[PDB]
Design a protein around this ligand. Sequence first.
Ligand SMILES: [Cl-]
Length: 276
Amino acid sequence: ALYEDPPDQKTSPSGKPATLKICSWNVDGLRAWIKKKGLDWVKEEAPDILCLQQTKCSENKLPAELQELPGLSHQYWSAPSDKEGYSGVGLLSRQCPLKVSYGIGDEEHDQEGRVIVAEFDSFVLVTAYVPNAGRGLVRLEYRQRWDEAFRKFLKGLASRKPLVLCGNLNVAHEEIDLRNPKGNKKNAGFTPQERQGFGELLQAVPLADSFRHLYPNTPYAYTFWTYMMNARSKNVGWRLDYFLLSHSLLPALCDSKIRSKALGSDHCPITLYLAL
DNA sequence: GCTGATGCGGCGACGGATCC
DNA sequence: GGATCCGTCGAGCGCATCAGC
Ligand SMILES: [Cl-]
């Protein structure tokens, strides 16, 4: 079935208007995404904060266009030190964060270019490009050990300020989160191990899945489609991209959007509206 | 400098069997 | 004998390195 994201709900359960718009996009090659006009789409979305994943771009290679975003002028970038051309994340913000850090505890020795932490007045934002389990699950054990390290890391942060985690978490949590659950149960992104890791992330930190919280029974809502086999035109997809929130932020939650129509990557943007 | 091949990382279509 | 299950295979894209010029 095709999918039509419902209209933007811009007011919280208590009637407060949204004051903060966060957009997250796994761009699958930041320089190619720009050439495919992804920044034109960002401009129309006008987020306060833009998180980008799979940029595949070290900071010296950022296109000039990123220097022409006056409403997203505070920019933080990360890319892995060995595997240049892979992973890579970015966080761009209208207002300057109070603190920024990289990685999940030892980035200075294992510069992975997967995680950015930014602390604002009212919340801490984490964006992540979570390690894929690999074709044939060759890196699944690593993914499980990464999941555990990440959970512990985030539990520490959320003990201080409320947490917003966004990005490509690279698992479809439940069967409703992908088009072909039965055929993919031995594939990266839908193994029992990865699904369990996501469930434990929600329980241990604790975090809520903003979109599923608002739309608990809505199927065919995906954020990724393989480039092969015309999967996007058929909406044969996976929901890999999330906004997870501390429970205490749920009264600020206005809406969590899937921007299905925005092209330029094999993932689409997702957008969060918060009343802070 | 530039192009294009190759390497590497990030699953749905289809054929055949099985279920009742 | 239509629906479902299951395993196999052939498959887009981006960016790095490498060869060639
Ligand atoms: Cl990558």
